[PDB]
Amino acid sequence: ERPTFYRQELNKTIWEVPERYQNLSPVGSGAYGSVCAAFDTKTGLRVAVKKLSRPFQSIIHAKRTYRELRLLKHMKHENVIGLLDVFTPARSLEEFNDVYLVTHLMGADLNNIVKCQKLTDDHVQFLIYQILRGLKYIHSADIIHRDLKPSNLAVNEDCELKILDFGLARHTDDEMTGYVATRWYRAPEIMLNWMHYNQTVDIWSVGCIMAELLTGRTLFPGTDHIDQLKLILRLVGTPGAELLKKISSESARNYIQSLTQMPKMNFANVFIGANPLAVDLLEKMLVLDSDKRITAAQALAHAYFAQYHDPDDEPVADPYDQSFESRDLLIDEWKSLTYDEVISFVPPPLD
Numbered sequence: 554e555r556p557t558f559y560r561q562e563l564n565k566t567i568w569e570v571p572e573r574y575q576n577l578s579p580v581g582s583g584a585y586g587s588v589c590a591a592f593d594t595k596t597g598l599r600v601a602v603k604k605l606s607r608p609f610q611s612i613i614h615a616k617r618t619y620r621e622l623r624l625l626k627h628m629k630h631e632n633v634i635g636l637l638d639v640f641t642p643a644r645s646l647e648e649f650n651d652v653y654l655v656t657h658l659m660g661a662d663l664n665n666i667v668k669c670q671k672l673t674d675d676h677v678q679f680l681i682y683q684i685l686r687g688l689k690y691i692h693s694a695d696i697i698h699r700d701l702k703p704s705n706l707a708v709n710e711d712c713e714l715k716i717l718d719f720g721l722a723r724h725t726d727d728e729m730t731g732y733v734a735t736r737w738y739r740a741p742e743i744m745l746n747w748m749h750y751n752q753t754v755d756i757w758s759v760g761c762i763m764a765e766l767l768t769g770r771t772l773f774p775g776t777d778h779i780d781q782l783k784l785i786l787r788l789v790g791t792p793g794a795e796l797l798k799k800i801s802s803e804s805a806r807n808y809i810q811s812l813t814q815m816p817k818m819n820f821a822n823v824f825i826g827a828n829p830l831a832v833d834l835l836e837k838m839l840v841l842d843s844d845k846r847i848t849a850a851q852a853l854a855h856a857y858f859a860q861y862h863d864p865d866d867e868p869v870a871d872p873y874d875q876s877f878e879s880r881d882l883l884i885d886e887w888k889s890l891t892y893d894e895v896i897s898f899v900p901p902p903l904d
């Protein structure tokens with residue numbers, strides 16, 4: 554019942570995987586793990602396999618490993634990453650130190666797509682429809698992505714899209730500093746730590762992404778946090794008293810009040826020649842007050858997606874128990890929890 558495993562060294566890390574996975578080649582790495590492409594001989598799919606790096610080295614890491622496996626097991630949606638397989642070479646809990654996560658290899662990310670091919674309005678409609686369809690599902694489980702950006706959106710050759718989170722980097726202060734894509738899609742309340750954030754932080758990200766699909770250019774390519782804020786406030790206007798009250802960070806509030814007040818721009822004069830319905834949706838997504846942003850479910854009913862919208866085929870998630878998030882456990886308790894989840898994994902059917 555347990556498959557046979559074989560070992561190999563790729564870019565100075567050991568991969569020990571079931572025999573079903575062949576032709577492993579490295580695709581990326583970071584602080585939390587490494588990814589390889591492979592051929593799954595069982596299903597006949599090209600796959601991507603993330604090996605987590607020392608998943609139980611700290612409490613923070615062990616809880617993260619549990620969190621990821623729990624999230625990935627729950628996800629059952631066409632526009633979101635699905636777990637094809639999870640495995641470990643360990644034969645018991647006592648020797649359980651390694652976690653490997655398998656999903657479909659899609660072919661490209663959305664950075665590839667915006668860089669290398671011109672998109673018509675129909676392409677923008679279809680790609681953004683799918684992001685929002687997946688986001689509806691994600692948000693219905695009270696899950697916030699928080700790092701929606703083109704490199705976390707995988708796209709096949711028929712422009713079918715999946716939301717994922719490679720999750721290889723730490724998102725430290727340094728990784729978020731300077732002229733960097735890691736910060737250009739973040740809602741300003743997350744970027745500047747204004748307040749406790751909502752799931753519409755992800756709608757801001759969709760707005761930034763949609764703008765970029767329409768123009769071919771980054772919406773807010775700030776050279777740093779403050780420059781990026783300035784670019785944002787030039788477009789959407791400076792906040793009024795109502796939003797200022799909601800900024801619970803007194804330090805952040807003090808700084809924004811130092812800026813000269815600016816009105817919202819005419820978005821038809823920014824997104825020159827775009828579908829007026831695209832421009833209308835953008836204005837509803839790129840609202841500074843996150844209480845007043847359009848939701849994913851609201852946005853799916855917008856006239857821009859009239860050719861794709863089907864309210865009978867935009868499903869929500871099964872209930873997701875996140876009570877673990879408020880729980881303090883030891884490493885070995887997170888480990889055993891994670892081990893139970895690996896052991897109980899049942900793969901999806903191959904249609």
Ligand SMILES: CC(C)(C)c1c/c(=N\C(=O)Nc2ccc(Cl)cc2)n(-c2ccccc2)[nH]1
Pocket residue numbers: 588601602603617620621624625628633634654655656696697698716717718719720
């Ligand atoms: C889209 C959603 C929000 C459900 C999410 C997905 C996710 N993980 C992944 O996408 N995992 C992944 C990505 C690529 C590969 Cl090859 C294998 C696994 N999250 C993740 C990543 C790291 C830590 C915790 C959660 N969060």
